[PDB]
Amino acid sequence: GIFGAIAGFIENGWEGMVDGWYGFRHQNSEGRGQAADLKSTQAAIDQINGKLNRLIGKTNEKFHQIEKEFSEVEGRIQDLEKYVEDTKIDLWSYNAELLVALENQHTIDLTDSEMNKLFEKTKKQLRENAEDMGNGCFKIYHKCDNACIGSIRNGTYDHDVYRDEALNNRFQI
Amino acid sequence: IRNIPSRISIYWTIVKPGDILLINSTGNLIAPRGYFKIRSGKSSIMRSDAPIGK
Ligand SMILES: *[C@@H]1O[C@H](CO)[C@@H](O)[C@H](O)[C@H]1NC(C)=O
Numbered sequence: 001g002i003f004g005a006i007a008g009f010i011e012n013g014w015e016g017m018v019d020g021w022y023g024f025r026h027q028n029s030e031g032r033g034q035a036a037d038l039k040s041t042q043a044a045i046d047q048i049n050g051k052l053n054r055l056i057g058k059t060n061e062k063f064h065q066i067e068k069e070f071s072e073v074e075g076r077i078q079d080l081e082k083y084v085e086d087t088k089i090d091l092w093s094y095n096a097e098l099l100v101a102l103e104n105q106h107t108i109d110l111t112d113s114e115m116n117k118l119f120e121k122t123k124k125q126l127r128e129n130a131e132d133m134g135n136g137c138f139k140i141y142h143k144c145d146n147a148c149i150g151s152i153r154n155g156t157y158d159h160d161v162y163r164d165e166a167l168n169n170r171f172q173i
Numbered sequence: 174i175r176n177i178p179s180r181i182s183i184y185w186t187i188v189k190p191g192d193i194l195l196i197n198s199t200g201n202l203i204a205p206r207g208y209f210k211i212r213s214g215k216s217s218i219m220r221s222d223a224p225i226g227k
Contacts (some may be wrong), residue, residue, distance in 0.1 A: 064217035 002109040005116040010136045021045070021111075022118050026149045033146070035153055040118045044111050051103055125152060127159040129166035141169035187211065 001007060017023050020036025021044055066081050119136060130138040142165040151157040181203055188194050188208075196202065 061215075063215040069220070 001112060003112040003116040005119060005136070006108070006112040008112075009134060010115065022115055024122075024149075024153055026144075028144050028146075028149060030145050033149070035150075037118055037153065040114050044114045047110055048107060051107070122152065125155070125157050125159070127163070128170070129159050129162050131170065141166040 006013075014023075014025070014034075017034060017036060020038060021041040023034060023036035023041075025034045026032060066084070068081070068085055070078055070082075122138070123130075123132065126138060126140065129142060130140045133139050142162045144162075148157075148162075186194065196204070
């Protein structure tokens with residue numbers, strides 16, 4: 001939520017993207033297509049598995065304790081045993097509620113973050129050859145075939161190759 | 174209780190090494206036949222009616 005990409009300038013997610021969490025959709029003179037971006041998806045996954053690693057399969061061993069159920073009324077000593085346990089139970093219960101709320105807040109935001117980074121990286125690659133249409137898409141001001149699109153995704157796009165072409169198109173009257 | 178009006182009260186005593194158990198009695202003693210070993214560790218007790226599984 002906090003970076004404003006996911007549930008923000010990105011209108012919605014793509015349910016048809018099933019081979020990654022982030023990716024690219026393009027349209028050009030040869031058609032329109034889709035490809036997942038592996039590195040950003042993995043970055044998000046890696047952070048979430050880290051949380052799970054702290055939380056899953058990490059329980060504490062306890063053995064002989066105090067009794068916690070009672071068949072007879074006893075008063076002072078029994079009140080304390082019960083109170084000790086209730087107090088304990090309430091505090092563990094607090095940490096967990098807080099933990100989940102906090103973890104969940106950080107996860108949506110970190111995932112929002114990863115989407116934004118990929119956008120920003122993409123934005124920089126295109127230099128002056130594209131403009132941000134404001135909804136996460138770039139209008140690219142030059143002929144850009146599948147190989148061209150592939151180069152952007154693959155991080156090997158050479159802005160110098162297309163710059164003259166793009167500038168003429170951007171700055172037309 | 175089970176047709177018995179009398180009772181026995183149970184007590185316990187721990188004796189350290191170098192120490193000595195002394196019993197002085199003039200009646201009504203229900204005598205120990207010996208001692209239990211006492212250990213320390215991870216053992217406990219739980220009240221439950223759940224079946225034991227393999
Ligand atoms: C990225 O482009 C380079 C240059 O052609 C190529 O060697 C490589 O296979 C490409 N990477 C992917 C995963 O498409």
